[PDB]
C-alpha cells in the first residue's frame with residue numbers, strides 16, 4: 001500500500017508491473033475545485049483539504065468536449081476520443097513515479113493537444129509508465145478545460161475572462177511545485193512537454209509571467225502559439241461569445257447576465273452550438289482558444305516573442321514530415337482515408353477554399369502559384385501532396401520554425417527535430433505519410449513494449465528518442481551519449497541546423513522548408 005501525504009491530504013496509489021519492474025501510478029488526483037455551477041467559465045479555484053485517503057487508482061472524468069464521429073469504429077480517429085466519462089468535474093491530474101521511490105527525480109509534465117476543443121490525459125498514447133520505468137523520471141499529466149467551457153472570453157470580465165483552460169494547466173504546475181517532492185520529485189527540475197495545442201500551450205507558459213517560476217525547460221511537439229489556429233483575437237472572441245449567446249437564447253445587454261444565462265445551460269447545449277459561432281469554419285477551426293486576456297497573456301504574444309519577453313531557458317521543438325494530411329479527409333473534396341485521394345487541379349483549388357475561406361482570391365492563387373510549380377506536371381499525386389504540404393506548412397511547420405528562430409535569437413539553446421518515421425501500426429492510409437500526432441507514441445515509449453507489434457527498428461528509435469527527451473529534461477541537452485549517436489547541434493537563426501528522426505540514418509540538415517516558409521512568414525501575412 002503506497003500512500004503519500006500531499007498538502008491537501010493523503011492519496012493512495014497503485015502498483016504497475018512494467019518491463020519486469022514496478023511503477024507507482026496515482027491516477028486522478030484533484031488539483032482544483034470542480035468548476036461547476038457559479039464556477040463554470042471562471043478561473044479554477046484552489047482545492048480544499050480533505051482528511052480521508054483519496055483513492056487515486058483510476059483515471060478521472062475527461063472534460064466536456066465534442067467527440068470526433070467522422071469515422072465510427074475506426075481506430076485511427078477513435079484512439080483520440082475520450083476514454084473516460086465526460087464531465088465538467090474534470091480538473092484532475094496523474095503522477096507516475098519510479099519504483100523504488102526516487103530521491104530527487106526530474107519531472108516531465110505532459111499537456112495534451114486537440115485543437116483546444118478536445119483531448120484528455122487518460123489516452124493510451126499518453127501513458128507515462130514507460131518513461132517512469134525506463135528513465136526514472138516522474139511523469140505528470142493533467143486534464144484542462146477545452147472548448148467554450150475552457151476558453152469562452154468576455155475579456156476583462158471575470159465571469160468569463162478567457163484562458164481558463166490555460167489557468168487550469170497553470171494550477172496543475174503549481175500543484176507539482178507544492179507537492180511533487182513528497183513523491184520523490186525535484187520541483188526545481190520540471191520540463192513541460194506537449195503536442196499540437198498542448199505544445200502551443202507550452203509556448204504560452206514560456207510567455208506568461210505567472211508560469212515562469214513553475215518550470216525549468218520546455219518541449220514543443222508540432223505546435224507553437226504563433227500558429228494561425230492558436231490564438232483568437234479579442235474581436236473574434238467577443239463575436240464568438242455573442243454568437244454562442246444568440247444560439248443558446250442567452251442574448252442579453254448586461255454582459256454578466258449573458259454569462260449567467262449560459263451558466264444554466266446544459267453542457268451539451270453549449271457543445272452543440274460551439275461549431276457554428278463562426279460563419280465559415282475549416283477542419284482546423286479552433287472556435288474557442290487562447291486570447292489576450294491581460295492576465296495569463298499581458299499582450300499580443302507575437303509582440304512578446306519579437307521583443308524577447310519570455311522565460312530564458314532551453315527549448316526542444318519539432319514537427320512531423322506530413323503534419324497537414326490528417327485534416328484533408330475532414331472536408332477537402334476528393335479526399336478519403338479509404339482511397340489514394342488523387343485530386344485534380346480543380347479539387348485542389350476547392351481545397352484551398354475549404355482551408356482558407358476568408359482569404360482573398362489573390363491570396364488563394366498565391367498559395368497555388370507557390371505550391372504547384374511542378375518538377376513533373378504529369379505525376380497524378382502532385383495536387384494531393386501539395387494540399388497536404390500547404391496545410392502542414394502553414395499551420396504547423398513554418399510557425400514552429402519561426403518560433404524557434406525568434407526564441408533562439410535571445411541567447412537560449414534550442415534544438416529542432418524533423419520526425420519522419422511512419423509507424424508500422426498506423427491505421428491511416430499510406431498516402432497520409434508521417435501524420436500529425438504519430439510521434440507521440442514514440443516519445444512515450446510504447447514501441448519499447450515487445451508485445452505491441454512494433455518492429456525492432458521502431459523499438460530502437462523510441463529508445464533513443466526517450467533518452468534524448470529525458471536527457472533534455474534532466475540536463476538541457478537532448479543527446480544520446482552512449483550508443484555512438486549523431487550529435488544534436490543547437491538550432492541557431494543563422495545556420496538553422498536540425499536533426500532528423502527516423503529508423504535508418506539520423507541526419508543533420510539545415511534550413512527546413514526554407515522556400516515554403518519564406519512564403520508563409522513574409523508574404524502570406526500581407527494578404
Ligand SMILES: *[C@@H]1O[C@H](CO[C@@H]2O[C@@H](C)[C@@H](O)[C@@H](O)[C@@H]2O)[C@@H](O[C@@H]2O[C@H](CO)[C@@H](O)[C@H](O)[C@H]2NC(C)=O)[C@H](O)[C@H]1NC(C)=O
Nearest residue numbers: 235236239240242243244245246247275276277278279280
Ligand atoms: C460576427 O458574427 C456575425 C453573426 O454571425 C451570424 O450569427 C451567429 C449567431 C452565428 O449563427 C453565425 O453562424 C452567423 O453567421 C457574422 O455575420 C454573418 O456574416 C455572414 C457572412 O459574413 C452573413 O452571411 C450573415 O448573414 C451574417 N449574419 C448576421 C446576423 O449578421 C459576422 O460575419 C461575424 N464576423 C466575422 C469577422 O466573422
Ligand SMILES: *[C@@H]1O[C@H](CO[C@@H]2O[C@@H](C)[C@@H](O)[C@@H](O)[C@@H]2O)[C@@H](O[C@@H]2O[C@H](CO)[C@@H](O)[C@H](O)[C@H]2NC(C)=O)[C@H](O)[C@H]1NC(C)=O
Nearest residue numbers: 329331332333334335336337338339340341342343344347
Ligand atoms: C476517393 O473517395 C472520395 C470519397 O467518396 C466516398 O468514399 C469512397 C471511398 C466511396 O465509398 C464513394 O462511394 C464515396 O462517395 C471520392 O469523392 C467523391 O467523388 C465523387 C465522384 O468523383 C463526387 O461526386 C463526390 O462528391 C466525392 N465525395 C467527396 C466527399 O469528396 C473520390 O472521388 C475518390 N477518389 C478516388 C481517386 O478514388
Ligand SMILES: *[C@@H]1O[C@H](CO[C@@H]2O[C@@H](C)[C@@H](O)[C@@H](O)[C@@H]2O)[C@@H](O)[C@H](O)[C@H]1NC(C)=O
Nearest residue numbers: 001011012013014052053054055056057058
Ligand atoms: C479506498 O481504497 C481502500 C483500500 O482498498 C483498496 O481499494 C479498493 C478499491 C479495493 O481494490 C481493495 O482491494 C484495495 O486494497 C478501500 O478500502 C476504500 O473503500 C476506498 N475508499 C473509497 C471511498 O472508495
Ligand SMILES: *[C@@H]1O[C@H](CO[C@@H]2O[C@@H](C)[C@@H](O)[C@@H](O)[C@@H]2O)[C@@H](O)[C@H](O)[C@H]1NC(C)=O
Nearest residue numbers: 103104106181186188189190216473474475
Ligand atoms: C534536489 O536538487 C536540488 C538541485 O536541483 C538542481 O538544479 C535543477 C535546475 C535541476 O536541473 C537538477 O537536476 C539539479 O540537481 C537541490 O537544491 C535540493 O536540495 C535537492 N533536494 C533533495 C531532497 O535531494
Ligand SMILES: *[C@@H]1O[C@H](CO[C@@H]2O[C@@H](C)[C@@H](O)[C@@H](O)[C@@H]2O)[C@@H](O)[C@H](O)[C@H]1NC(C)=O
Nearest residue numbers: 460463464465466467468480481482483484
Ligand atoms: C543502446 O544499445 C543497446 C544495445 O546495443 C548494444 O550496446 C551498444 C553500446 C553497442 O555495444 C551495441 O553494439 C550493442 O549491441 C540497447 O539495449 C540500449 O537500449 C541502447 N540505449 C539507448 C539509450 O538507445
Ligand SMILES: CNc1cccc2c(CN(C)CCC3CCCCCC3)c[nH]c12
Nearest residue numbers: 077114115229283284285286326436437
Ligand atoms: C490545430 N489542431 C486542431 C484544430 C482543430 C480541430 C482538431 C482536432 C479534432 N478533429 C477535428 C481532427 C482530428 C485529427 C487530428 C490529427 C491526428 C489524427 C486524428 C485526426 C484535433 N486537432 C485539431
Ligand SMILES: *[C@@H]1O[C@H](CO)[C@@H](O)[C@H](O)[C@H]1NC(C)=O
Nearest residue numbers: 252253254255256257258260
Ligand atoms: C449586470 O448585473 C449585475 C447583477 O448581477 C451587476 O452586478 C452588474 O453591475 C451589471 N452590469 C451592467 C453593465 O449593468
